[PDB]
C-alpha cells in the first residue's frame, strides 16, 4: 500500500515529462558528467 507505478505507466507519463525542462541552476550540475575520450 504505497505510491507505485508500472514500467508502462512511467513510459506513458514520460510523454507529459516531454513538456518540462531544466533551468541553468540544476542543468549546470550535469556538466560534471564526462564523455569518454577518443582513441586514435
Amino acid at each position: 500500500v504505497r505510491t507505485m507505478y508500472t514500467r508502462e505507466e512511467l513510459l506513458r507519463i514520460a510523454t507529459l515529462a516531454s513538456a518540462m525542462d531544466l533551468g541553468p541552476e540544476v542543468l549546470r550540475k550535469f556538466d560534471v558528467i564526462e564523455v569518454a575520450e577518443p582513441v586514435p
Binding site: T3, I13, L22, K29, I33, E34
Partner: protein
C-alpha cells in the same frame, strides 16, 4: 500542475577521477539533481549521459533523498549491496543503457521490491572491462527480500556475475 508524485525523492550523484578529492574522499561525490515526480525523473534521464558514451572511470549513484551512497550512512550501515558485472550519426540505445533505464524506472516506481524501506539506492560503475550494477539495500539479514530483489533485478536487466555483499 498535475504532477505524478513519487513514493520517495531520489538524488543522483556522479564521481570519477576528475572529481577525486585526494584530501577528503567523501567530497569526491557530486550530487547533481533531486527528483520528486515521474516527470522530473524523465527530465533527469534526458540530461543524463548514456553509459555507452560515459567515461571509463565513472559512477552514477541514485539514492533516496537524505541517504548518502556510502556505508557510513545509517541507511546502509546494516545493509549491503547486490551487484552484477555486465559487459561492454545517431545510434540505438545499447542493452546496457536499456538495463540501466529499466532499473532506474523500477527504483522510482517502487517495483524493485513489491512487498520501513528495503532498497536505499543503486549504483552504476563504468569499469575497464566490466560494468558493475549494484542495488544497495538496508537489511542484510533479510533473505527472502534479497531473493525477491534477485528475481526483480534479473527481470529488469538483459545485458556474468551476481554477488551479494554485506557492508
Amino acid at each position: 500542475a498535475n504532477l505524478h508524485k513519487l513514493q520517495r525523492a531520489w538524488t543522483l550523484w556522479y564521481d570519477s577521477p576528475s572529481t577525486y578529492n585526494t584530501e577528503n574522499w567523501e567530497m569526491s561525490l557530486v550530487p547533481i539533481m533531486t527528483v520528486h515526480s515521474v516527470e522530473e525523473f524523465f527530465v533527469m534521464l534526458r540530461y543524463m549521459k548514456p553509459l555507452h558514451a560515459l567515461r571509463t572511470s565513472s559512477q552514477y549513484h541514485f539514492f533516496q533523498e537524505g541517504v548518502k551512497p556510502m556505508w557510513e550512512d545509517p541507511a546502509n550501515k546494516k545493509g549491503g549491496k547486490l551487484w552484477v558485472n555486465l559487459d561492454i550519426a545517431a545510434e540505438a540505445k545499447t542493452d546496457l543503457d536499456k538495463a540501466w533505464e529499466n532499473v532506474l524506472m523500477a527504483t522510482v516506481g517502487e517495483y524493485l521490491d513489491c512487498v520501513e524501506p528495503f532498497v536505499t539506492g543503486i549504483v552504476m560503475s563504468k569499469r575497464k572491462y566490466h560494468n558493475r550494477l549494484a542495488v544497495w539495500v538496508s537489511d542484510a539479514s533479510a533473505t527472502d527480500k534479497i531473493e525477491a530483489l534477485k528475481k526483480a533485478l534479473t527481470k529488469e536487466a538483459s545485458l556474468a556475475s551476481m554477488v551479494f555483499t554485506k557492508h
